[PDB]
Amino acid sequence: TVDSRIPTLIRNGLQTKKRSFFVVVGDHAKEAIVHLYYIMSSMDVRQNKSVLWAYKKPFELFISLNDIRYCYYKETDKILGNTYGMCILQDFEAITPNILARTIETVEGGGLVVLLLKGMTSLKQLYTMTMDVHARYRTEAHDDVIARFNERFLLSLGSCESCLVIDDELNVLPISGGKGVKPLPPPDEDEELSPAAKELKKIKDELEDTQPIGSLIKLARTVDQAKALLTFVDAIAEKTLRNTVTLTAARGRGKSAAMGVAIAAAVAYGYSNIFITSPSPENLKTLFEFVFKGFDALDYKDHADYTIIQSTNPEFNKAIVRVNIHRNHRQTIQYIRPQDAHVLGQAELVVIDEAAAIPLPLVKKLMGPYLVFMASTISGYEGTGRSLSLKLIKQLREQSRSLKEITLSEPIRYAQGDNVEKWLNTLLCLDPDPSQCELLHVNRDTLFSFHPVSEKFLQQMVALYVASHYKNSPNDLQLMSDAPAHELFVLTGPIQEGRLPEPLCVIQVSLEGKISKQSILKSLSRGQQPAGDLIPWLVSQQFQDDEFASLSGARIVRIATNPDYMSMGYGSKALQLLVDYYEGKFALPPLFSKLSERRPEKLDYVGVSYGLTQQLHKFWKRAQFVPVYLRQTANDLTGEHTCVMIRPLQDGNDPSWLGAFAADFHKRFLSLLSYKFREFPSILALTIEESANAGAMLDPSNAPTELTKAELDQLFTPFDHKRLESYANGLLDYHVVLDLMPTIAQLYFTGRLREAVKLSGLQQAILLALGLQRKDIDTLATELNLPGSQVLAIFMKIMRKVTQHFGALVSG
Amino acid sequence: TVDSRIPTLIRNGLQTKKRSFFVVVGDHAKEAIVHLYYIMSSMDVRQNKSVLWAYKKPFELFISLNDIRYCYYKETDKILGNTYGMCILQDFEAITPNILARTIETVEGGGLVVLLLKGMTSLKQLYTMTMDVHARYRTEAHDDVIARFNERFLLSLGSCESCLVIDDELNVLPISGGKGVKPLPPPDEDEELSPAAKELKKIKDELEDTQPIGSLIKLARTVDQAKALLTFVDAIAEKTLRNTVTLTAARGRGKSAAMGVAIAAAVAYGYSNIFITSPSPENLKTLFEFVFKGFDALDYKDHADYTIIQSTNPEFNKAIVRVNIHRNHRQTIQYIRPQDAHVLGQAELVVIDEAAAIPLPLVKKLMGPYLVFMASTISGYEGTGRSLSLKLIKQLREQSRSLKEITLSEPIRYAQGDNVEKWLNTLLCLDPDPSQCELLHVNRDTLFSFHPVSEKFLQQMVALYVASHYKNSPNDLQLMSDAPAHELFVLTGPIQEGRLPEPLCVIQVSLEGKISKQSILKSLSRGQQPAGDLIPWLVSQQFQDDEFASLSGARIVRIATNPDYMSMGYGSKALQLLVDYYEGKFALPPLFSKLSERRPEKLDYVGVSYGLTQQLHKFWKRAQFVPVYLRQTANDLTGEHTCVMIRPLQDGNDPSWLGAFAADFHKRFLSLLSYKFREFPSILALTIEESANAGAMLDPSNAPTELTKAELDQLFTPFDHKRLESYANGLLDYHVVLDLMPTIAQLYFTGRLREAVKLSGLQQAILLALGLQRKDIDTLATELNLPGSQVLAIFMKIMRKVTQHFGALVSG
Ligand SMILES: CC(C)(COP(=O)(O)OP(=O)(O)OC[C@H]1O[C@@H](n2cnc3c(N)ncnc32)[C@H](O)[C@H]1OP(=O)(O)O)[C@H](O)C(=O)NCCC(=O)NCCSCC(=O)CSc1ccn([C@@H]2O[C@@H](CO)[C@H](O)[C@H]2O)c(=O)n1
Ligand SMILES: CC(C)(COP(=O)(O)OP(=O)(O)OC[C@H]1O[C@@H](n2cnc3c(N)ncnc32)[C@H](O)[C@H]1OP(=O)(O)O)[C@H](O)C(=O)NCCC(=O)NCCSCC(=O)CSc1ccn([C@@H]2O[C@@H](CO)[C@H](O)[C@H]2O)c(=O)n1
C-alpha cells in the first residue's frame, strides 16, 4: 500500500493546477518514481506529458511507454521555454541553484517535481556530503569546506505544504512539510469555473469578429497576457512612432509569447522594418517560436509567404536572426546586437528584449523616433535588480514621447500562488547619520540555519545584492554559503535589543593569498592555474612576480548598499570601518559578532576586481585604492573592462611592493590607451592615470626626474623644435605637428614634464586624448561637448607652454 | 536694316530646334542683344522663356518686359538642371571653360547663345588680353604669360555653321563660321512630323491604360528616355532582387529625369526602403525634382501623403536627404554617402548616381542582394573617362546576378547633332616594342593654333587624359594652354614621314622652384602662400626648410598612357626618357621637337604629387622616386591621400639634401600610422616605409646604428624582458605583451634592429600593423586573408626572434 497523503497531494495538485514536490531517498528510487507516475496518471488523462530526466553522467516497461527526455546538467540551457509533465533530478551532488531554477520552472501545474537522493542511513549526514562544485571553492590556503547550503535545503522543506519526502518503501518522514495535508472537496466542472477563465474567454469572444487581433488573441493563455496583447495591438494599430510600451514581468509569466504575438500583429498591420535587439540571439527562441505561431494563426504558408534566415556559421547555430515577409508586402524581422543602433534609421518597430540587462547608454541609443517595445524580468530567476529597472523606467519617464507600463502576474504553467514556486524562491532567495553607524560581522554558521530571524536577515541582505545585479544568479548564494574563507560584513545603525537591525550596507570579503613560492613557479611555467584565487593569481601572471602572491590579502567580492540610501555615505563608512578592523584598530553562535570581539587576520593588502565605471572608480580611489591591472577585452554582457585595485592596508609596513606594481601599470596604461582603450572617454582615462601615478608615488625610488638637454636632444631634432615653435606661434596647421604628440604626451604623463608646466584638468584630458588615445579633433570635441575650434584653441595653449619650456631649457 | 543671315540663322535654329551662336563686339552690345531678342521672339511664340545673364561684378524696356535671371560666375553651379531661352555672357576675361560648359548647355533648342566682347580695334588683339585667371598661373620664377586659349577660341568659330560674329552695327565678319548659311525650306506641321515624335507618342499611347507606367511615361520627352523608363519599370515590376540596370549617357541627355521617374515607379510599386547613394547630395536636385514630379503625376498630395526631410544644418541646405511615404505603408527615399554601405541591410532599391565617379571598392561594397540602379556620365562635361566606365562594366559583368545596360543618345533641350554643342565639344575638347619608342616634345605655340593636324593631335592627347580622370574638367585645358612654364612631352613609336605618330604616352611637366630665400622667409612667417608652386611651397612649409625651395625642379603634373596599351611598359619608358633628357644625356614652329634638338634646363630634382595607390606607388618607386610628404586628410571625392615624391635626378651632385627630407618623413611616417593612417592596409604602409627608408639611405650620415645594452636598458625594464621571454615561450597570452609592441616596432623599423633580426614581408607587415597601426588581430587577419590563429602563430615567431636577440645582447 501507499500512505494516503501521497495520492491526496497528487490529486490536490492536479485539481488546483499546482505543482507537487516529492523527494525520494534510497537505492531504488526507480520504483518510487514509477509508483508516483502511475498514481499521477491514473487520476488525470489531460496531463500525461513528457518526463524530464536530468543526470550528470515496471520501470523497464515505464521507460518504453512514456516520452522521456534526458538532459545533462550543463545542457539545461537547452530546455528553456519547454514544458514537461514531471521533472526528475538524479544527482544531488551536482544540482547547483541555477540547475534547480532552470529545471523546476519547466513543470506544468499538477505535475511532479521529483528529486532523487542516494540511500542515506540518516538525513543528518546530508549537511556534510561532497558537492561536485565544492572542488572549485577549495584552495591551497583553505582546503576544508563546511557545507551549509544542504543544511538550509533540508530545513527549507518543512516550509512547503506541497513537499513530501519519501523513502524507497514510500513512507513519509517528519521532515516533510506537507504531512498535515488534507483532501480538497471534489470539484464541479458543470457550472463552476474560475473567474480568470471566464475573463479570458470573454476578452477572446468579444474580439473574435475583428482581425487580425481576433486570430492573434486566441494564443494568449492568461488574462494579463491578453491585456498585454491588447495594449500592444492598440499601440501598433495606432501606427504612431511616438509610442513606447514596456513589459515587466517575472520569469515564466510569458513575456516572450506576448511580445512574439505582438510582433506578428505588427507584421500583419503593415510594418516593413522590424528590429529585435537582445543581448544574445539564443534568448530569441521562444519569441520567434511564438512569432511563427502567430504567422500560422494568420493563415500564412511556410516557404511561400515567409522564409526564415538562420545564422549557422557562428556559435549560435539554432538562433534565428532574420525572417522575411513577402506576402502582404516586403517585411523583415531582423535581429541586431544592442551596439548596432546605427541601423535603426528606417526602423518602424524596435523591440528590446531584456531591456533592464542592456546597459543604459545602449538603451538610450537604441531609442529613436519610432515605436519601441521593451521587456524586463524584474523578479524570479535570471531577473534584474529593482534598482536597474527603476533607473530605466525613470529615464523613460524623463525622456517621455509616450510611455506605456504593463505588468504580468499570473503564471502560465502553474496556478498563481504555487507552493513549489514559493519554496524554490526561498531556498534560492529569488525574490541615520553615517558616522553613527557601526559594522558587525555576520556569522555564517547561523545565517544559514533556517531560523526565522536568521532567514529573515538572510533574505534582507540577499535582496539588497539582487537589485545590484544586471542578471540575478542564485549560484552566488551557494558560493557565499559553502565558501571556505568567505566572510560577510554588514553595516547597521544604532539598534537596541528586541529589534533586528536594518542592513544599510553588506560587504562580502574573501581571504586570498598565502600561496607557496614553489606552487607559484610551478604555475608560472605553464598556462594552467588553480583558479582558486583571483587577485594573487592575476598579478603573479601579469607582472611575472613570484613574491606578491605569497602575501596574505582580502578580496572584496561584493559590496552593496541599500538603493534607497545610495550616495549618502554608508558604503564609504562601511569600507573605512572594515579597513580599520583589518588594520588592528579594534581590540548556536550569535548571529552578529561586533568588530571589537573577533581577532582580525594579519593582512598585508585588500583588493577588489570590478567592472570599470567612472563613479565606481571615483569611489574606490576615494577609498585609497590604486589600480594594478585593467583588462583590454571588455565584457560582452556588460561592456566594461575588469579593473583590479589593491590597497596597502597594513600600517607600519613599507608599501613599496605595491609601488612597483602601480608604476609598472601606470606607464603601461599610458600607451595602452591605443590598445582596446581608444574608446575610453578622456576624463575617465585621465582619472585612472592620476590614480595610478598616485599609487606609484608610494615608492620613493619611483619619483620622476627632471628633463635635461642631453636627453631632450635625444628625442627631438632641431627641426622638430622649429616645427613646434612655429605651431606655437599660430603659423602652422596642427596636422603637421602630430607625430610629436606621442612624445610630448609621454613626457608629460610620465612625470618628466609634470612639474615644469602646469596644466588644468581640461588641458590634461585633451593632451592625453590627442597623444596617447590618438583621437581626432571631431571625436574629442563631441566627447567634451565643445566646438571643434575651441578644442584646438585650448590645444595651442598647451603647446605654447611646452614650447616655452623647451626653449628655456635649450637656451640655458 | 540687318544682314539677311541673322534672321535666317535664327529662323533655321527655331525651325530645326537647334541652338544659334552669336558673338557681339563693341561698347553697346545691349542694342545688339535687344535687336537679336526681338528677331528671335517675332518668329516664334512657344519659345519666349527666361533670359540668363552672367557677369563677374529699347534696352530699358527690354529689361522690364522679360524674365531675366542674373547669375554670378562663381554661382553657375546654382543653375544646374534649369533651362533658359537665351544665355548671355558679359565678361570675356572671366569665362573659364567650366563656365562655358555650365552656361551653354542650359539653352533650349532654337534659342540664342550670345557672348559679349568689349569693343576691339582689331580681333587680332584678342590673343593677348589679360585673363582674370592668368594671375593664378603666374609665379615669381615665371611671370610672363602668352595667352593661347583665346587664339584657338577665335579660330574655332570658323568651324561652326551656326556661329555668327557681329559688331555694334550688326555686321557679319569674315571670321564668322556661318556666313555661308542658307534659308531652309518652310515646314508643314499639318502632316509632316519627326519620326522620333511619332515613336514617343506611340510608346506613350500604347501604355496609357496601364498604371502606374501609363502616368509615369507621360513625363519622358525622348525615345531613349521612354525606353529607359520602360526597362526600369520592367525591372521594378519584376520585383527581383537579382536585377541590376546601369544607365550610361552624356551630360544633358536626361539620366536624372529617367532615374527619378524610375524611383517614383518603384515607390508606386510597393517598395519600402529605397536608398540613393551619390558623391554629394547637391547632385540630387533634379533627380528629386523629377521624383516629386512623378509623385504629382501619381495623384499624390503634398504634406498629406508624403513629407520631405531636408538637411539644413550642414552646408548643403537645399539638398533633399529623406522623403517619407505613408500612402498605405511606410516607404522612405534616403540619401546615404557611398561609404555608408552598412545601412543597405534592408535596402530594397539602391540607386547609385554617378557610379563611375564613385571609387571601385565603394561600388563593390554598395552592391548586395537587392535591385541596383546605376548612372554614369561617360562623355560631355563633368564626365568620366572611358577607362573607369570600362572597369566598372567589366566588374559588373564578372560579378553577374543579372546586369542590364542601357544608353541615352538624343538630348532634350536641343536637337540631336546641334551645331553649338559640336563647337563647345571641340574648343573644350569634351569628347610596338617599348624599347623602340622615342620621346618628342610637343610645341605649345602650334598645338593650339587650330591647324587640322595640330587640332587632331590635340584632341588625341586630350582624349587620352579624359579617360584617366574620375571627373572631366575642361579648366585643365586652359591651364595647359596658358601656363607660363608648362611643358608637354609625348611618347611615340617609330614613325615615318606623311603619318602623324600615335601618342602612346603623354607627360605634362611643370617647371617649379628658383624662389628667393627672402620670399621664403616672408611666407614662412605667415600662413599665406603664393600658391604658384606646389612641391617647393609644400616642402618648405612642412619641413620649415628655407633652402629647398630655392632649387630648380620639375613637377610631373599629369602622366597618362593609352588605356589599350596600359601595363605594357610605355609609361616607365617615357619617364626614363624624360629623366635622361633632364640629366643632360641628349646633346610656324614644328609641332614636334625631338629631345636631341632642344637644350634641357638645369634641374636638381623632379617631383610628383598624386593620390596614393598601391599600383601608382609601385610604379613611382620603380621609377626611383622617394616620398617626402603624405597628407593625413583623405580626399573626399577620391578617398586617397596626397603623396609627394621627389627624385634627385641630377648626377654628379650630392643627393644629401633629399636624404634629410626622406629620413624626416620616414621616422615621422612610422608612428604617424596611428594618425589618420590606421586605415592603411599593412602591405601598402610597409611598402611606403621601405621606400622612405631607401630614400633616407642616400645620406650616409642617416645610416642606422646598432643596438647596445646601455640604450636597451633605458627602454625595457628587466620585468619587461621577463614578460617578453615568457611570451616567446608560449606561456603567456599575447594581450599582456602589447605596450611593448610600439617600442619593438619602432626599434625594428627605424633600423636599429633591422640588421640583427631577419623578417620576411608578411612578418614585417604584421609587425608594422600591430606596432604602429595598433590594429586588432581580427582586423589584421581579415585584411591579410589569414585565420586569426595563424596571425598570432606567425606573430609569436617574430617575438621568438626579438627575444633571442635581446637575450644574446644582455648576456654578452
Ligand atoms: C557604490 C556603492 C559602494 C555604494 O555607494 P555609496 O553608498 O558608498 O556612496 P558614497 O557616499 O559612499 O560615495 C559616493 C561615491 O559613490 C559612487 N556611487 C554613488 N552612487 C553609485 C552607484 N549607484 N553605483 C556606483 N557608484 C556609485 C559615486 O561615484 C560617488 O558619489 P559622489 O558623486 O562623489 O557623491 C555600491 O557598490 C553600489 O552602489 N552598488 C553596488 C555596485 C556593486 O555591486 N559593487 C561595487 C564594486 S564590487 C563589484 C565586484 O566586486 C563583483 S565581483 C567580479 C565580477 C566579475 N569579474 C570578471 O567578469 C567575469 C567575466 O565572466 C569574470 O567572473 C571576471 O573576469 C570579476 O573579476 N569580479
Ligand atoms: C600608371 C601609368 C603611368 C601608366 O602605367 P604604365 O604604362 O607605365 O605601366 P608600366 O609597365 O610602365 O609599369 C607597371 C606598373 O604600372 C602600374 N600600373 C599599371 N596599370 C596601372 C593603372 N591602370 N593605374 C595606375 N598604375 C598602374 C602598376 O603598379 C605596375 O604594373 P605591374 O603589376 O608591376 O606590372 C599611367 O599613369 C596610368 O595608367 N593612368 C593615369 C594615372 C594618372 O593620371 N597619373 C599618374 C600619377 S600623376 C597624378 C597627378 O599628378 C595629378 S595632379 C594633382 C591632383 C590633385 N592634387 C591634390 O588634390 C586636390 C584636392 O582638391 C588638390 O588639387 C591637391 O591638393 C594634387 O596635389 N596634384
Side-chain angles (χ1 to χ4, degrees), chain A residues 304-330:
Chain A
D305 304 315
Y306 60 112
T307 85
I308 318 163
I309 292 181
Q310 148 165 328
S311 203
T312 68
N313 175 239
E315 308 311 299
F316 28 82
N317 178 19
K318 296 172 58 62
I320 311 289
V321 178
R322 186 163 167 137
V323 171
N324 287 307
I325 308 310
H326 56 184
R327 181 185 173 123
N328 334 119
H329 66 118
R330 183 46 183 239

mmCIF file of all heavy atoms in Angstrom, chain A residues 304-330:
data_model
loop_
_atom_site.group_PDB
_atom_site.id
_atom_site.type_symbol
_atom_site.label_atom_id
_atom_site.label_comp_id
_atom_site.label_asym_id
_atom_site.label_seq_id
_atom_site.Cartn_x
_atom_site.Cartn_y
_atom_site.Cartn_z
ATOM 1 N N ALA A 304 6.357 29.919 -48.698
ATOM 2 C CA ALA A 304 5.620 30.518 -49.803
ATOM 3 C C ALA A 304 5.292 31.968 -49.482
ATOM 4 O O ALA A 304 5.285 32.824 -50.372
ATOM 5 C CB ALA A 304 4.344 29.727 -50.095
ATOM 6 N N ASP A 305 5.016 32.249 -48.208
ATOM 7 C CA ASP A 305 4.760 33.606 -47.753
ATOM 8 C C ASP A 305 5.852 34.161 -46.853
ATOM 9 O O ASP A 305 5.922 35.382 -46.684
ATOM 10 C CB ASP A 305 3.420 33.680 -47.010
ATOM 11 C CG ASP A 305 2.264 33.171 -47.844
ATOM 12 O OD1 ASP A 305 2.180 33.546 -49.032
ATOM 13 O OD2 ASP A 305 1.438 32.400 -47.315
ATOM 14 N N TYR A 306 6.698 33.312 -46.275
ATOM 15 C CA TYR A 306 7.804 33.792 -45.464
ATOM 16 C C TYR A 306 8.934 32.775 -45.489
ATOM 17 O O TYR A 306 8.701 31.564 -45.482
ATOM 18 C CB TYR A 306 7.384 34.068 -44.015
ATOM 19 C CG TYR A 306 6.847 32.878 -43.252
ATOM 20 C CD1 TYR A 306 7.561 32.335 -42.197
ATOM 21 C CD2 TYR A 306 5.622 32.314 -43.570
ATOM 22 C CE1 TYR A 306 7.078 31.256 -41.489
ATOM 23 C CE2 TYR A 306 5.130 31.236 -42.866
ATOM 24 C CZ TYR A 306 5.862 30.712 -41.827
ATOM 25 O OH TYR A 306 5.376 29.636 -41.123
ATOM 26 N N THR A 307 10.162 33.286 -45.515
ATOM 27 C CA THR A 307 11.366 32.474 -45.447
ATOM 28 C C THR A 307 12.149 32.848 -44.199
ATOM 29 O O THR A 307 12.212 34.023 -43.824
ATOM 30 C CB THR A 307 12.249 32.663 -46.683
ATOM 31 O OG1 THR A 307 13.096 33.804 -46.494
ATOM 32 C CG2 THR A 307 11.400 32.865 -47.925
ATOM 33 N N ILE A 308 12.749 31.848 -43.563
ATOM 34 C CA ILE A 308 13.451 32.014 -42.298
ATOM 35 C C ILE A 308 14.948 31.940 -42.558
ATOM 36 O O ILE A 308 15.439 30.955 -43.122
ATOM 37 C CB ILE A 308 13.019 30.946 -41.280
ATOM 38 C CG1 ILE A 308 11.503 30.752 -41.338
ATOM 39 C CG2 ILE A 308 13.463 31.328 -39.888
ATOM 40 C CD1 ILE A 308 11.026 29.478 -40.688
ATOM 41 N N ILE A 309 15.671 32.976 -42.146
ATOM 42 C CA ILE A 309 17.120 33.038 -42.290
ATOM 43 C C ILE A 309 17.736 32.786 -40.924
ATOM 44 O O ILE A 309 17.505 33.551 -39.980
ATOM 45 C CB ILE A 309 17.581 34.384 -42.865
ATOM 46 C CG1 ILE A 309 17.130 34.525 -44.318
ATOM 47 C CG2 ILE A 309 19.090 34.517 -42.762
ATOM 48 C CD1 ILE A 309 17.571 35.814 -44.966
ATOM 49 N N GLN A 310 18.528 31.723 -40.821
ATOM 50 C CA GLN A 310 19.118 31.289 -39.565
ATOM 51 C C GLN A 310 20.634 31.354 -39.677
ATOM 52 O O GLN A 310 21.205 30.881 -40.664
ATOM 53 C CB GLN A 310 18.662 29.871 -39.219
ATOM 54 C CG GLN A 310 19.676 29.046 -38.460
ATOM 55 C CD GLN A 310 19.064 27.809 -37.840
ATOM 56 O OE1 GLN A 310 17.897 27.809 -37.450
ATOM 57 N NE2 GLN A 310 19.851 26.743 -37.746
ATOM 58 N N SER A 311 21.279 31.937 -38.671
ATOM 59 C CA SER A 311 22.731 32.097 -38.671
ATOM 60 C C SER A 311 23.365 30.794 -38.204
ATOM 61 O O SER A 311 23.290 30.438 -37.027
ATOM 62 C CB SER A 311 23.143 33.262 -37.782
ATOM 63 O OG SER A 311 24.412 33.766 -38.154
ATOM 64 N N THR A 312 23.999 30.077 -39.131
ATOM 65 C CA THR A 312 24.614 28.796 -38.811
ATOM 66 C C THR A 312 26.122 28.889 -38.634
ATOM 67 O O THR A 312 26.704 28.069 -37.914
ATOM 68 C CB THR A 312 24.302 27.769 -39.905
ATOM 69 O OG1 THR A 312 24.976 28.138 -41.115
ATOM 70 C CG2 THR A 312 22.805 27.705 -40.164
ATOM 71 N N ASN A 313 26.770 29.859 -39.279
ATOM 72 C CA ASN A 313 28.225 29.967 -39.185
ATOM 73 C C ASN A 313 28.715 30.240 -37.767
ATOM 74 O O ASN A 313 29.650 29.554 -37.321
ATOM 75 C CB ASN A 313 28.723 31.031 -40.172
ATOM 76 C CG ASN A 313 30.215 31.280 -40.054
ATOM 77 O OD1 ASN A 313 30.649 32.399 -39.777
ATOM 78 N ND2 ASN A 313 31.007 30.236 -40.267
ATOM 79 N N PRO A 314 28.154 31.200 -37.002
ATOM 80 C CA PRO A 314 28.663 31.425 -35.640
ATOM 81 C C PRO A 314 28.266 30.325 -34.669
ATOM 82 O O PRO A 314 27.720 29.292 -35.071
ATOM 83 C CB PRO A 314 28.038 32.772 -35.247
ATOM 84 C CG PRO A 314 27.593 33.390 -36.530
ATOM 85 C CD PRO A 314 27.178 32.237 -37.376
ATOM 86 N N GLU A 315 28.556 30.537 -33.382
ATOM 87 C CA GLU A 315 28.298 29.511 -32.377
ATOM 88 C C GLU A 315 26.809 29.209 -32.241
ATOM 89 O O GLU A 315 26.415 28.040 -32.152
ATOM 90 C CB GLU A 315 28.882 29.941 -31.032
ATOM 91 C CG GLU A 315 30.344 30.342 -31.100
ATOM 92 C CD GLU A 315 31.190 29.323 -31.837
ATOM 93 O OE1 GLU A 315 31.256 28.162 -31.383
ATOM 94 O OE2 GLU A 315 31.787 29.682 -32.875
ATOM 95 N N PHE A 316 25.965 30.243 -32.220
ATOM 96 C CA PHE A 316 24.528 30.048 -32.021
ATOM 97 C C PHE A 316 23.910 29.587 -33.338
ATOM 98 O O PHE A 316 23.326 30.361 -34.102
ATOM 99 C CB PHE A 316 23.867 31.320 -31.506
ATOM 100 C CG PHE A 316 24.556 32.588 -31.924
ATOM 101 C CD1 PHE A 316 24.325 33.136 -33.173
ATOM 102 C CD2 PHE A 316 25.414 33.244 -31.061
ATOM 103 C CE1 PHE A 316 24.946 34.307 -33.557
ATOM 104 C CE2 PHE A 316 26.039 34.414 -31.440
ATOM 105 C CZ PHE A 316 25.804 34.946 -32.690
ATOM 106 N N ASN A 317 24.043 28.286 -33.600
ATOM 107 C CA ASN A 317 23.530 27.720 -34.843
ATOM 108 C C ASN A 317 22.009 27.801 -34.897
ATOM 109 O O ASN A 317 21.431 28.214 -35.909
ATOM 110 C CB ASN A 317 23.999 26.271 -34.986
ATOM 111 C CG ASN A 317 23.467 25.601 -36.243
ATOM 112 O OD1 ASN A 317 23.046 26.264 -37.189
ATOM 113 N ND2 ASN A 317 23.483 24.272 -36.254
ATOM 114 N N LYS A 318 21.342 27.420 -33.808
ATOM 115 C CA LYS A 318 19.886 27.364 -33.799
ATOM 116 C C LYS A 318 19.234 28.740 -33.757
ATOM 117 O O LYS A 318 18.011 28.829 -33.907
ATOM 118 C CB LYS A 318 19.406 26.531 -32.608
ATOM 119 C CG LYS A 318 19.816 25.068 -32.669
ATOM 120 C CD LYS A 318 19.475 24.342 -31.378
ATOM 121 C CE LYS A 318 17.989 24.428 -31.070
ATOM 122 N NZ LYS A 318 17.164 23.782 -32.127
ATOM 123 N N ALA A 319 20.008 29.804 -33.558
ATOM 124 C CA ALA A 319 19.432 31.133 -33.405
ATOM 125 C C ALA A 319 18.843 31.625 -34.719
ATOM 126 O O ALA A 319 19.468 31.502 -35.776
ATOM 127 C CB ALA A 319 20.491 32.111 -32.906
ATOM 128 N N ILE A 320 17.635 32.178 -34.650
ATOM 129 C CA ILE A 320 17.017 32.824 -35.801
ATOM 130 C C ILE A 320 17.379 34.301 -35.780
ATOM 131 O O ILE A 320 17.204 34.979 -34.762
ATOM 132 C CB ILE A 320 15.495 32.626 -35.786
ATOM 133 C CG1 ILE A 320 15.145 31.155 -35.559
ATOM 134 C CG2 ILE A 320 14.886 33.127 -37.077
ATOM 135 C CD1 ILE A 320 15.455 30.269 -36.739
ATOM 136 N N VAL A 321 17.883 34.807 -36.902
ATOM 137 C CA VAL A 321 18.397 36.170 -36.945
ATOM 138 C C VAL A 321 17.550 37.033 -37.870
ATOM 139 O O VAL A 321 17.395 38.237 -37.640
ATOM 140 C CB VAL A 321 19.874 36.178 -37.375
ATOM 141 C CG1 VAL A 321 20.403 37.597 -37.475
ATOM 142 C CG2 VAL A 321 20.699 35.382 -36.389
ATOM 143 N N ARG A 322 16.974 36.429 -38.905
ATOM 144 C CA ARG A 322 16.205 37.200 -39.869
ATOM 145 C C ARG A 322 15.022 36.387 -40.367
ATOM 146 O O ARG A 322 15.155 35.196 -40.660
ATOM 147 C CB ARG A 322 17.075 37.636 -41.052
ATOM 148 C CG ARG A 322 16.368 38.560 -42.018
ATOM 149 C CD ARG A 322 17.345 39.278 -42.924
ATOM 150 N NE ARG A 322 16.660 39.928 -44.032
ATOM 151 C CZ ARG A 322 16.928 41.152 -44.462
ATOM 152 N NH1 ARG A 322 17.868 41.892 -43.898
ATOM 153 N NH2 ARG A 322 16.233 41.647 -45.481
ATOM 154 N N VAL A 323 13.868 37.043 -40.459
ATOM 155 C CA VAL A 323 12.665 36.474 -41.053
ATOM 156 C C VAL A 323 12.177 37.440 -42.120
ATOM 157 O O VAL A 323 12.047 38.641 -41.858
ATOM 158 C CB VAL A 323 11.568 36.223 -40.003
ATOM 159 C CG1 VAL A 323 10.265 35.842 -40.677
ATOM 160 C CG2 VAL A 323 12.001 35.144 -39.033
ATOM 161 N N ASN A 324 11.915 36.926 -43.317
ATOM 162 C CA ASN A 324 11.488 37.741 -44.447
ATOM 163 C C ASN A 324 10.015 37.492 -44.732
ATOM 164 O O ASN A 324 9.569 36.342 -44.758
ATOM 165 C CB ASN A 324 12.320 37.436 -45.693
ATOM 166 C CG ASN A 324 13.723 37.986 -45.602
ATOM 167 O OD1 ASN A 324 13.922 39.173 -45.344
ATOM 168 N ND2 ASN A 324 14.707 37.128 -45.825
ATOM 169 N N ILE A 325 9.266 38.571 -44.944
ATOM 170 C CA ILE A 325 7.850 38.510 -45.284
ATOM 171 C C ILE A 325 7.673 39.127 -46.664
ATOM 172 O O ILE A 325 8.127 40.250 -46.905
ATOM 173 C CB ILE A 325 6.981 39.255 -44.253
ATOM 174 C CG1 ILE A 325 7.283 38.775 -42.837
ATOM 175 C CG2 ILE A 325 5.510 39.056 -44.565
ATOM 176 C CD1 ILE A 325 7.266 37.290 -42.688
ATOM 177 N N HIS A 326 7.029 38.386 -47.568
ATOM 178 C CA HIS A 326 6.806 38.890 -48.951
ATOM 179 C C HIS A 326 5.372 38.556 -49.375
ATOM 180 O O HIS A 326 5.105 38.445 -50.591
ATOM 181 C CB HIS A 326 7.866 38.327 -49.906
ATOM 182 C CG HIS A 326 7.950 36.835 -49.943
ATOM 183 N ND1 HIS A 326 8.898 36.171 -50.692
ATOM 184 C CD2 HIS A 326 7.233 35.885 -49.332
ATOM 185 C CE1 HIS A 326 8.743 34.864 -50.534
ATOM 186 N NE2 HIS A 326 7.737 34.668 -49.710
ATOM 187 N N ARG A 327 4.475 38.404 -48.396
ATOM 188 C CA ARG A 327 3.053 38.090 -48.699
ATOM 189 C C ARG A 327 2.282 39.401 -48.884
ATOM 190 O O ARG A 327 2.020 39.768 -50.045
ATOM 191 C CB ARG A 327 2.448 37.245 -47.574
ATOM 192 C CG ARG A 327 0.998 36.844 -47.807
ATOM 193 C CD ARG A 327 0.441 36.121 -46.596
ATOM 194 N NE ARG A 327 -0.987 35.855 -46.680
ATOM 195 C CZ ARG A 327 -1.535 34.649 -46.590
ATOM 196 N NH1 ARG A 327 -0.767 33.580 -46.480
ATOM 197 N NH2 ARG A 327 -2.850 34.515 -46.605
ATOM 198 N N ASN A 328 1.943 40.080 -47.782
ATOM 199 C CA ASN A 328 1.252 41.393 -47.877
ATOM 200 C C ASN A 328 2.193 42.374 -48.576
ATOM 201 O O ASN A 328 1.762 42.995 -49.567
ATOM 202 C CB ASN A 328 0.845 41.918 -46.499
ATOM 203 C CG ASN A 328 0.632 40.816 -45.481
ATOM 204 O OD1 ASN A 328 1.325 40.762 -44.468
ATOM 205 N ND2 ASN A 328 -0.319 39.934 -45.742
ATOM 206 N N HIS A 329 3.428 42.490 -48.082
ATOM 207 C CA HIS A 329 4.452 43.370 -48.712
ATOM 208 C C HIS A 329 5.807 42.997 -48.103
ATOM 209 O O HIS A 329 5.828 42.184 -47.153
ATOM 210 C CB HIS A 329 4.105 44.854 -48.539
ATOM 211 C CG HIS A 329 4.141 45.351 -47.132
ATOM 212 N ND1 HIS A 329 5.005 46.343 -46.723
ATOM 213 C CD2 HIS A 329 3.430 45.009 -46.051
ATOM 214 C CE1 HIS A 329 4.815 46.583 -45.433
ATOM 215 N NE2 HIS A 329 3.861 45.786 -45.006
ATOM 216 N N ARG A 330 6.900 43.556 -48.627
ATOM 217 C CA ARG A 330 8.240 43.150 -48.127
ATOM 218 C C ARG A 330 8.381 43.587 -46.666
ATOM 219 O O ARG A 330 8.410 44.808 -46.414
ATOM 220 C CB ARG A 330 9.360 43.725 -49.000
ATOM 221 C CG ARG A 330 10.752 43.282 -48.573
ATOM 222 C CD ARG A 330 10.825 41.793 -48.292
ATOM 223 N NE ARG A 330 12.136 41.383 -47.810
ATOM 224 C CZ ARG A 330 12.905 40.480 -48.406
ATOM 225 N NH1 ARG A 330 12.415 39.737 -49.383
ATOM 226 N NH2 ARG A 330 14.161 40.326 -48.027
#
